[model samples]
Target: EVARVRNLNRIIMGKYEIEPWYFSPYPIELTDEDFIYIDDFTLQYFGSKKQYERYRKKCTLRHPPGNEIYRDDYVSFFEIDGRKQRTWCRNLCLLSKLFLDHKTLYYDVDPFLFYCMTRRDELGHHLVGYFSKEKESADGYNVACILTLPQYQRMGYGKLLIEFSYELSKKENKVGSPQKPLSDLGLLSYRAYWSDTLITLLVEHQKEITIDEISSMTSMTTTDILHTAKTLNILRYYKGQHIIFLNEDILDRYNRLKAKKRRTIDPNRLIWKPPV
Candidate 1:
């Protein structure tokens, strides 16, 4: 019976092995200490049972205080060349594989640029998440291997990292998208961002905007713009031409979504420039 039970366990483990498109469950071992608070924003966590209760009562993921201000407690962004930070970055990739069903890319670290996100505290800096981009890409795949540690998930960190990647693309004046075959979570986040950004732009213009115009403004690809427009039910096929119509209903929805957005971009808060 014991042998049979062991065999069953093995079978289950093998059947459920991490895949390249799934997000692993949160690692319970990770704690607040693992993340360093480098900016002035206070780290909020349940220090005790009572504290946990209080935090649960007031958990706000969107528009957190001190987010617009550059404080010492803000998460720091580091741009490392593949050759210089290869070993350290590879280790991180391997670690991510355990929680990310995706295949690890440690072997391909040298040719790409790694954008690492870390939090700092009195003790030291702790890794939060990271994304990679190839040195040169004709297709504009500006972001690859994006991940926010499971422990730090759902706190707007993922969106912040995604926004940063687009910001870099904008600075370079090129259209960009994440590498293809995104994970489920990745697709959801990107779609949300694409919709929000496009809607905001359309509302601001309050006039007919072509796919090319939208792409030029947001640095998004035509395909992405079309997909987002279709998803939002704003795209119409009329006279063999695609048209985007923003009525009061669409505008209202956009406003509601904007109010509930978990993260925002503040150009003044960004201090880094795209690397040459």
Candidate 2:
């Protein structure tokens, strides 16, 4: 399982730096000291924001005053770094809030595996990226929610997160004497990447995927879908399954296609012109 994830990461990371793709190489082992970081990051990232404030308030309520945030406290959790207990608390808190409000949840991931990557310039500080996971497994099936902060967008970290989540899920499923392949469990639920190029890329690799399925999953029109199977030379096909990647190449293709669509419809960016 580790080998599979490593291979997946290697293939994807070829397009971007690995440092920005995760919070840390290790998952956090939650302890009483952990709350400070989780709370701090939560307060910093989500507290004052208009859109996230309501959710942040709920997290504050859950942890309240005495609760020690731990691996078991949240539905399921992962941390990037616990060294900065206060900083880690913020992200942890944010995730906790998200889980509390959502019906479907990931409650089995070990928090100890959170990771992050940083970039610095001569002017002192530059950028920081955070990553985390919420995972669940039952009767051999698994679902993982891997998320990264917006500053890290377009860095290929999302792909790495997915790859890592798959690996960790596989490990959890391998119990008992002889190690069993988690794929033996049947299906894994990947959070959908809703874009034509991404869907096309998955079809390229997995083959058993279809346009209608992609359209249904993404709410995109079949005619508007960016890539056809013939364009990518992918023949195998499947319906109604989560395809695991958008990779860098496909994302780039998607972006370019999106630009073209935008150009065709809006020459002067006047789509919102008033009453004209």
Candidate 3:
């Protein structure tokens, strides 16, 4: 069985400052397994139910929905058992190929780390989200992510997630560094995906100027900018321009730097080859 780590209570209460009294209606503690389930549930909730099911079906590699046994029961059972089986869903081989073809892994420099967000809700549902951070000149960092379930639309959760990530990042600082001062930080999201218009307004209207400024100029939300950057397979920093792409050579250099990490590629995906 997969060993459990932090739970919902620890994540929502300990790490965050939610008032304990307000959480009285819900059970506090949640196991690792429970968290995973909740995270998946949230993803499905924010993302369209139909789309989430399709992705699960594609990723699970199991038999057709009709022939599948223990539908929900088997899903829970497999999670509890930590099964590594692959089904009819797109194979990792295919995914790797897609990655290479599109050059999704092509980065000018390696990010400090990539955090996958998996959370569970009070109802025991789960979903997945991802956040990435890149260092900027003069000791600053740019962070972004999306956290919304399709079914639960327009609740400001995505913005909340981005803000939460920004706060968590402040705890890290280099040797002899006095809390790598956050020069500026902003949400990076796509308007089309989440329709977060306010974030864009905040970025554009602010006079000091940062990534948020560009978001405003584009009349798009930080989430919109972020999603667009991810789709383009590039990085978005908090500077004059919000989004930036890595050329082929830079990607090669990055691969060399991370030689020990597993590298996968797909030739079918399209990539941006910088001007020669």
RMSD (Cα, Å) for all candidates, in order, is 10.5, 20.2, 20.6
- Candidate 3 has what TM-score? 0.25
What TM-score goes with each of the models?
A: 0.67, 0.29, 0.25
Candidate with the greatest TM-score versus the true structure = 1
Q: Which candidate number has the best lDDT?
A: 1
Q: Scored by Cα lDDT, where does model 2 land?
A: 0.33
If the candidates were sorted by their TM-score against the true structure, best first, what order would they fall in?
A: 1, 2, 3
Determine the C-alpha RMSD for candidate 3 after optimal superposition of all C-alphas: 20.6
- Number of clashing pairs per prediction, in order: 13, 34, 43
User: What's model 1's overall lDDT?
Assistant: 0.63
Candidate 1 per-residue lDDT, tens place, 1-276, comes to 232211111101111322223332222233432211111112222224454445545644322221122223556666767777554555555545655656545556777787766666774555567787888866679897788866567888888788778877877888999998898888998998888787777778854577777777778888988999888888876556776778776789778977885556565566665557
- Model 2, 177-197: lDDT tens per residue? 111231211112121222343
Q: Which stretches of candidate 3 lie over 4 Å from their true place?
A: 1-103, 106-112, 122-125, 134-140, 144-153, 173-276
